[PDB]
């Protein structure tokens, strides 16, 4: 019964819209649902060079990259949860369903 759905996304507002839609769908389908547990983000800094040759002043790049993580805890049979996850998918949010 203990379902730990992990939602991974790079964008913030699309992930917030998806998890809010899942919470508002659980309220319509009348099941017990926990709030959005906001796990901390991750950062990836990349420092490279600009010039192909080794001449002139030394440049240093700053490439940033972020990724987030949310989770929705559920106490429901899986037949209800599959009907929820089949509806309204987008390529931004990646869903990981775990039942334990």
């Amino acid at each position: 019964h203990r379902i730990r759905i992990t939602l991974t996304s790079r964008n913030v507002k699309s992930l917030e819209k998806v998890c809010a839609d899942l919470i508002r769908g659980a309220k319509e389908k009348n099941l017990k649902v926990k709030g959005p547990v906001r796990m901390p983000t991750k950062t990836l800094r990349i420092t490279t060079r600009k010039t192909p040759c080794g001449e002139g002043s030394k440049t240093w790049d700053r490439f940033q990259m972020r990724i987030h993580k949310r989770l929705i805890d559920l106490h429901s049979p899986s037949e209800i949860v599959k009907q929820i996850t089949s509806i309204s998918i987008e390529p931004g949010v990646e869903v990981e369903v775990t039942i334990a």
């Binding site: 490279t48 700053r62 990259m65």
Partner: peptide, 18 residues
């Protein structure tokens, strides 16, 4: 290599914000 990485850096997902 770093030259092609800087070239196709935007298509991977990296961006220079700060």
């Amino acid at each position: 290599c770093r030259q092609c990485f800087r070239q196709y850096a935007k298509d991977i997902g990296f961006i220079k914000l700060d």
